[PDB]
Every structure is written in C-alpha cells, then in structure tokens.
Amino acid sequence: GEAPNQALLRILKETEFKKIKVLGSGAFGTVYKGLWIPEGEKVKIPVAIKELATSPKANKEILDEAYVMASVDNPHVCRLLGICLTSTVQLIMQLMPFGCLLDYVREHKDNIGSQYLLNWCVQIAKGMNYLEDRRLVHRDLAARNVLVKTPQHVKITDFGLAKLLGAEEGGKVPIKWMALESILHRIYTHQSDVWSYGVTVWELMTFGSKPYDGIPASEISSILEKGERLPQPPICTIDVYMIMVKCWMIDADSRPKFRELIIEFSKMARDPQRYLVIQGDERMHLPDSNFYRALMDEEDMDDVVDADEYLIPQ
Ligand SMILES: C=CC(=O)Nc1cccc(Oc2nc(Nc3ccc(N4CCN(C)CC4)cc3OC)ncc2Cl)c1
C-alpha cells in the first residue's frame, strides 16, 4: 500500500550521444565518458554511458538499476538522464568529472582542506537522508560509491544494491562497511546505513586508507562483537570521532539519525579548524572553464551545458 510511482523514464537514441573514452571496464560492461546532444537542442551535455554482450540474466539487474535511479531526484543523489534500448541496453547518466571520492581523496590527500571534508560529510548525509525520506535503503554506502561533480559538490551512487525499506528482500559483499546486524542477520535499515556512513567518513578522514587493513573478512564479524573498532584518525578531534563512534553502536536505534548528522556536521563546518586538525588547511585550494571541458572531452564546448541545468527535473 504505497503511493504510485510516477517517475518519468526517458528513452534516448544512440545516434544522439557519442562515446569519447572509457572510465572503467567491468568486462560485463564498461562506462564511457561521453557527450549527449538532443536533436534540435543546440546543447551538449556531458554524460557517462554504462554498457551491460546482451546476456539475458544481466539485463534484469541493468534495468532494475534504471528503475531506482529514475525514481529518485536530489542534488546529492546521482541522476539518471535516460536509457537507450540498443542490442545491449545502455544506461545514460550525468558525468562527474572528478570521479569517485575515494580515488579523489587519495590523489589530493596533501591538498585537501579541513572545510572540504566537513562539507562532504554534510552533503553525504543530506543525500542519504533524502533516500531515507524516499524509504530507499542504499545497502552499500562507501567512499568509492560517492562521486564528485566538483570538489565543492559530490553526489551518491551505486543503487543496484539499494532496496526499499518495506521489502523483505562475483557474489561479492563488502563486510567492512556492513553494520553488525546486517552481517549476522542480513538485516538492512536506514540505521544500518548510518553504520555504513561512519565507515565512509572514516575513509575521508583517513584520506582513503583501507578499513581493517590486513584483516580477513571472516574475522571481522567476531571483532565487531568484542567492541573493537576503527582507530581515531590522526586529524580527527574527539568531537568528530565520537560522532563516528555513535554510528557504530551495536543497538541500531541508538545510532544517530541522518538528519542529526547534517546538523552536527554543519555546526562543525562553521568552525572547521576547531574540529579537524590538518597542516596548513588555511592555504590549500583545489580547482571550471569551458576550455577545461574541451580538455576533458577534447571538443569545442561553446554549446555545452550540464545535466543539472539542462535536466531541470520536475
Ligand atoms: C568503484 C570505483 C569507480 O571507479 N567507480 C566508477 C568508476 C568509473 C565510472 C563510474 O561511474 C561514473 N563515473 C563518473 N565519473 C568518473 C568516474 C571515474 C573516473 N575515473 C578517473 C580515472 N580513474 C583512474 C578511474 C576512475 C572519472 C570520472 O569522470 C572522469 N561519472 C559518472 C559515473 Cl556513473 C564509477
């Protein structure tokens, strides 16, 4: 008994969009950086195209991802522009130039400011909170999953795992980000996500260090029971770490709600220096020119517009 889903699904012709380069290869599918032009639009929008090939088993997963992505719209949640029904179904999405946050943090670990990390934490919370609002449980929150539209702006992604809160329900599951209740009982909840959220913040705070490094996955479930947990990061103040710790509490109801996380981090954002300690944050900067876009896609960019401006969803 739920409200009807009226989300609009858009079908896009292959002729309209041309792939430029490959971001990653899944063997099953690869994602290509690309430019999409609507016919008689006189606009070019940067997008990423995902290819499943044509194995029948594969398609249901491919489309399911499409069904969830189409349904949800938020600034901090990744946007699906449409799909193309070619011999192999193609998924078209807004392109984040700077890529996954997890990679980004590592590239720029020296140059990343105190303010940015706190701001990223708020952005992630907003996006997750909205999903919670939608009653959609991500089921897989990770640093790699979050993507950077710009250093200032980041959005969530990888919804294939994601399932509705109501619903009862190679072959790889990441234990480390998974909440304890989930690991023992395969239980997933928004509260479950928060635990996933805490790890993600740990990744940012630790600048992409792998969690529980050198630890067998099998071991971890036991370790959690003891109450052992990830170490406080060097940069982190107690105020920040405690917030992370609360996420990891065994009793889910106890873990901080997402809306609170936005609030707690936002206050911290006002005075970044006080909460997080890093050497010379005050004199650090990171990257918007059309010419740069030309560098990105090696093409004239006079008419280029981004999906957010163009999509104007709603
Ligand atoms: C699981 C980590 C990961 O690489 N995820 C990933 C990788 C490639 C593409 C991807 O999906 C997207 N990626 C992007 N942007 C993007 C992603 C990764 C990258 N890189 C940049 C080069 N790096 C070595 C590999 C990943 C670059 C991107 O924009 C230039 N935009 C939209 C989507 Cl849907 C996710």
Author numbering: 696 to 747, 750 to 866, 873 to 990, 994 to 1020
How does the study describe this entry?
The epidermal growth factor receptor (EGFR) is an important therapeutic target for non-small-cell lung cancers (NSCLCs). Unfortunately, in most of the cases, NSCLCs with EGFR activating mutations eventually develop resistance to these drugs, and in at least half of the relapsed cases the resistance is caused by a single secondary mutation in EGFR that leads to Thr to Met substitution at residue 790 (T790M), the gate-keeper residue. Through analysis of a panel of EGFR+SKLB complex crystal structures we identified L718, V726 and L844 as the key residues to directly interact with the N-9 substituents of SKLBs, which explained why these substituents significantly affect the inhibition potency/binding affinity of SKLBs to EGFR.
In order to covalently link to the kinase through Cys 797, a branched chemical structure was used in WZ4002, in which a phenoxyl group was attached to the C-4 position of the pyrimidine core to carry the electrophilic acrylamide and bring it in close proximity to the side-chain of Cys 797. Our previous structural studies revealed that the 4-phenoxyl moiety of WZ4002 passes through the hydrophobic clamp. Therefore, we hypothesized that the hydrophobic clamp structure should play some role in the binding of WZ4002 at least in the reversible binding stage as it does to the SKLB compounds; since a phenyl ring is not the optimal substituent for interacting with the hydrophobic clamp, the interactions between the hydrophobic clamp and WZ4002 (in the reversible binding stage) may not be the optimal. In order to test the hypothesis that the hydrophobic clamp affects the binding of WZ4002 in the reversible binding stage, we determined the crystal structure of EGFR T790M in complex with WZ4003, a reversible analogue of WZ4002. Interestingly and in agreement with our hypothesis, the 4-phenoxyl group of WZ4003 adopts a conformation obviously different from that observed in the T790M/WZ4002 complex. The hydrophobic clamp model can also explain the previously observed phenomenon that WZ4003 (a non-covalent analogue of WZ4002) binds to EGFR rather weakly, and explain why the newly discovered L718Q and L844V mutants are resistant to WZ4002 and CO-1686.
